[PDB]
Amino acid sequence: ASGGSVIAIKYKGGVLMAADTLLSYGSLAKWPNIPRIRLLGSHSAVCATGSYADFQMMAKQVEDNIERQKMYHNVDELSPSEVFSYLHRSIYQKRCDFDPCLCQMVFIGVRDGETFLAGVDDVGTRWEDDCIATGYGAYIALPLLRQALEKNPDGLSRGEAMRILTDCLRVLFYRECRAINKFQVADAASDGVRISEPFDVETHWEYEGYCFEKTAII
């Protein structure tokens, strides 16, 4: 099994991470109604591309660590950046054992103002931006997010960023083979991460240039 693509963007006050709700087995769309967005602790969320077993094990291993640490000792729960750091160190440690965690993850989180959005590969590479995307979203979706960021660097609004998230999800549906039209958007604001109900983006297949006579190679 293997997930699809993930995209994520920071707006004025929070983060948005969108992902399709589908698990494929090679070319076969196996399960179209499973949730791929997990959320860790009470401030952060994660979503992985590629093999599902590895993401399922790694997210479980980093969700056991958060709750135990907070329950055993009287300490504050880990900030987004620190649970992401632990995620990255564990992925790198699994890679040194030739036991790779073959999934590119996108990690979002918000804690009282300091909003955090990072991404980690499976070889151990980690980065942070104002827009992340894995799978094929790094090629198709990411350029659109980058232009929508730079056309107004002051900071997008929540609706003005949800718009472009829909506009990139549409193209990802058009141009990615192993994808379906039923996505989910996890929105992380100061209160905390909140996953939305599945929704569908509308499409357009009625260009005149697609008519039977024109596309014909007689």
Binding site: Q69, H73, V75, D76, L78, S79, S81, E82, V83, Y86
Partner: protein, 238 residues
């Protein structure tokens, strides 16, 4: 008395005599006093005095990380065994989570490390007591470890030889510490410490270490060089 031959033997009165002896090792070390403020923690340790021309110098105060620190009392040959472990663990934590280990988690680590050594035959309890001083998200923390393995979150404490007088002084001013500022904290700590020295000996830069750790202040030790800001003007006014 034949019920103190081992650390794994209970006296008919449910007492561990090896640990009650190890407590006497702390009760005979050099005196140290810790005072916790609202945003700063101040440790003040009384080192050994020079014999009229010659200066013996031994490290009692340690830095464990940017925000932690510890003043030991008792057998130093155990204090180093514990400081190596605490440094190793605060590094293993800062490597994973890239942030300073919280005090409420480090005190428990010290407690477990102690307890692991009071339950087997081929072991012995650390005859050393610690004064942990830290600062994290929740503010300043001052602990104190004993050989038995306990850990006590204190507001102000003192341990070592003739530290009972230091505690008798501290148990009058410990209600106003949340308001006295840094200089006032170090003055309270020094006045409490000088109340444990011998009769004809007074505090001076030669026989006092002052460690400080607070909100915007990493753990800084203070020896002879810059102790004079807190030490050169100081009188034990009764």
């Amino acid at each position: 008395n034949e019920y103190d031959s081992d650390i794994t033997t209970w006296s008919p009165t449910g007492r561990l005599f090896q640990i009650e002896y190890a407590n006497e090792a702390v009760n005979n070390g050099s005196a140290t006093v810790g005072v916790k403020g609202k945003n700063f923690v101040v440790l003040a340790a009384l080192k050994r005095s020079p014999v009229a021309e010659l200066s013996s110098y031994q490290e009692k105060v340690f830095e464990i990380d940017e925000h932690v620190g510890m003043s030991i009392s008792g057998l130093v040959a155990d204090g180093r065994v514990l400081a190596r472990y605490l440094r190793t663990e605060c590094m293993n934590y800062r490597y994973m989570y890239s942030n300073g280990m919280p005090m409420n988690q480090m005190a428990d680590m010290i407690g477990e490390k102690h307890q692991r050594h009071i339950q087997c035959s081929g072991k012995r309890p650390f005859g050393v007591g610690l004064l942990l001083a830290g600062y994290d998200r929740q503010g300043p923390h001052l602990y104190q470890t004993v050989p038995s393995g306990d850990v006590y979150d204190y507001k102000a404490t003192a341990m070592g030889v003739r530290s009972q007088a230091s505690r008798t002084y501290l148990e009058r001013h410990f209600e106003h510490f949340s308001d006295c500022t840094l200089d006032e904290l170090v003055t309270h700590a020094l006045k409490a410490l000088a109340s444990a020295t011998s009769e004809g000996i007074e505090l001076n830069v030669k026989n006092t270490t002052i460690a400080i750790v607070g909100k915007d202040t990493p753990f800084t030790i203070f020896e002879e060089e810059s102790a004079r800001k807190y030490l050169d003007g100081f009188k034990m006014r009764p």
